[PDB]
Design a protein around this ligand. Structure first.
Ligand SMILES: *[C@H](C)c1cc(=O)[nH]c(=O)n1[C@@H]1O[C@H](COP(=O)(O)O)[C@@H](O)[C@H]1O
Ligand SMILES: *[C@H](C)c1cc(=O)[nH]c(=O)n1[C@@H]1O[C@H](COP(=O)(O)O)[C@@H](O)[C@H]1O
Lengths: 257, 257
C-alpha cells in the first residue's frame, strides 16, 4: 500500500535528509527539483529566489559556474532555508573511493560543505559509496545512486540497475535513494528522482530523451521530477515551474488514491 | 605483430595527440603516467618539474586542487613543453552530452583549454563522447574511454567493456584510447592506460586493487601505467618514478621481441 510523502518522512528507517525533504514536499505540495544549469552566480541566485516556493530541491551545477565562490553558496543556503528546499549538487561522482572522497570534501568547491545531497555512479563498485560516506556522514549528508540514465544508449540497465539497488540497500545510513527513470526499489524509505522530463515529447541533439511528469511519477512510480531546460528556456520561468509542479503533484496524488 | 611506440606514432589512422604521445614515449623511454593526486599547486608543480623527464604524461586532478588558478595551469603547460609530457585531466566525465560539453569547456577550470587528454565513462551512451567532441575536436584534444576499472566490484566488465570498445571505434576522430586493466582493442592505433598499479601486491581501504607494471604491461598487454600513491607516498618521489619507469619500459621492451 502506497504511503504519502508525509508518512514516508516518519518511517523508522528513514534517513534524516530524506525525512526533511519528504516533509517539505508535503508542506509545499511540490515534488519538483529545478536543474539550475546556468553559467553565472547571479542567474543561480535569481532562479533560486524566484522559483524557491515552487520546488522541493535545487540541483546545482558548480562545475559550470564561471564565478563560483563559497560566498555564493552561503547565500544559496540562506535562500534554501528561507524558501525551504534542499540543495543537490549535480556532479556525477564516478571514481574509486579514495579519489571521490577528496573530490567531495575538497578542492575549490568543497561540495560536502554546502550540498545536502550528491549523486554517484555505481560503476566503480561500492567503494565509491564508502569513500563519499566517510565525508558525508559526519556532515549529515545523503547520497543518490544512479541506477538508470535518461540518455540514448545508457548502459545503466538490467544487472547494473540491480547492482545499484543492492548497493543502496547495503549503505542505507548514507544512500537515501536513486537517480532513475522509474521506481527501482520496493522500499519506501528510498527516494526516486527522475531527470529527462518535459511536458512534450522529444529529446535534445546530444542524446537526452524526455518523458512527461505523468509518465514518470504516475505510471513509472518515481517521486520527484528533475527539470532544467523545460523551465529555464521558457519565457515565463515561474509559470513553467508551476506547470511542472502541478503536473508532478497531481500525478503523485493520483497514484496515492 | 607487435609494433614499437615509435612505429605506432606513424600508423595511418593515428590521432595527432596520440602520435605526439607515442613519439615522446619512444624518445624518452617512458610509458609512465604520474597521477598527481595532491592538493597544493606548489606540490603539483614541484612534482611536474622534478619528475617531468621520467614521465610521458601527468594526470592532473583539478577537482582536488585547493589553490587552483588558470595561472597554475599556465606554469604546468610550460613544464609539459619543457620536459615533453602530455597533460591528462582525471575528471571522469559521466553525464549526458549537453552537460559534459559545458563541464569540459567551462566553469572556473576551463579544462579543455589546458588538458591534452580527458577521460569519460561510457554508461550514459555515446552522447557523452559526442558532447566532449564538440569542444575538443578543434582544439586537437583526445579522449580515453573507461572500459574497465581497477576497483573491487567494478561493473565495467563483459558487455559494458565491449560497448566501450565499440564506442571508441566509432568515434576515432576524438577517442584515442582507453582506461583499462588490459588490452581491450586489437587496433594498435588505440592507447591502453592502466591505473591500479604498484610494485608491491595489495590495495587500499576503499576498494582500490593493485597489479604490478610487469603484469599489466607485460602479460595484460597495456601501454602505459598510471601510478599515484606508489610514487606520491615515497619519501623520494623521483627515485620512485624511476623505478616505475624502468619496470614499465622493460616490460614493454620484452613483449616486443
Ligand atoms: C543527472 C541528475 C542526470 C542523469 C540522467 O540520467 N539524466 C540527466 O539529464 N541528468 C541531469 O539532469 C539534468 C537534465 O536537464 P534537462 O531537463 O535535460 O535540461 C541535467 O543536469 C543532467 O545532467
Ligand atoms: C581513473 C584514471 C581511474 C580509473 C580506475 O579504474 N582506477 C583508478 O585508480 N583511476 C585513477 O587512477 C589513480 C589511481 O591512483 P593510485 O595509484 O591508486 O594512487 C586515481 O587518481 C584514480 O582516480
Amino acid at each position: 500500500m502506497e504511503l504519502s510523502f508525509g508518512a514516508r518522512a516518519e518511517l523508522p528507517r528513514i534517513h534524516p535528509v530524506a525525512s526533511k525533504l519528504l516533509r517539505l514536499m508535503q508542506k509545499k505540495e511540490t515534488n519538483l527539483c529545478l536543474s539550475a544549469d546556468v553559467s553565472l552566480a547571479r542567474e543561480l541566485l535569481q532562479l533560486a529566489d524566484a522559483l524557491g516556493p515552487s520546488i522541493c530541491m535545487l540541483k546545482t551545477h558548480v562545475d559550470i559556474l564561471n564565478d563560483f565562490t563559497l560566498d555564493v553558496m552561503k547565500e544559496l543556503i540562506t535562500l534554501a532555508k528561507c524558501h525551504e528546499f534542499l540543495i543537490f549538487e549535480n556532479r556525477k561522482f564516478a571514481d574509486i573511493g579514495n579519489t571521490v572522497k577528496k573530490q567531495y570534501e575538497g578542492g575549490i568547491f568543497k561540495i560536502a560543505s554546502w550540498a545536502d545531497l550528491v549523486n554517484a555512479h555505481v560503476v566503480p563498485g561500492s567503494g565509491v559509496v564508502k569513500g563519499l560516506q566517510e565525508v558525508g556522514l559526519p556532515l549529515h549528508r545523503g547520497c543518490l545512486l544512479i541506477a538508470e540514465m535518461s540518455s540514448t544508449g545508457s548502459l545503466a540497465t538490467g544487472d547494473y540497475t540491480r547492482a545499484a539497488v543492492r548497493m543502496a540497500e547495503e549503505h542505507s545510513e548514507f544512500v537515501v535513494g536513486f537517480i532513475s527513470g522509474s521506481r527501482v526499489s520496493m522500499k519506501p524509505e528510498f527516494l526516486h528522482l527522475t531527470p529527462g522530463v518535459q511536458l512534450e515529447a522529444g529529446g535534445d541533439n546530444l542524446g537526452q530523451q524526455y518523458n512527461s511528469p505523468q509518465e514518470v511519477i504516475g505510471k513509472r512510480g518515481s517521486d520527484i521530477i528533475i527539470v532544467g531546460r523545460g523551465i529555464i528556456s521558457a519565457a515565463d520561468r515561474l509559470e513553467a515551474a508551476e506547470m511542472y509542479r502541478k503536473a508532478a503533484w497531481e500525478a503523485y496524488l493520483s497514484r496515492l488514491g
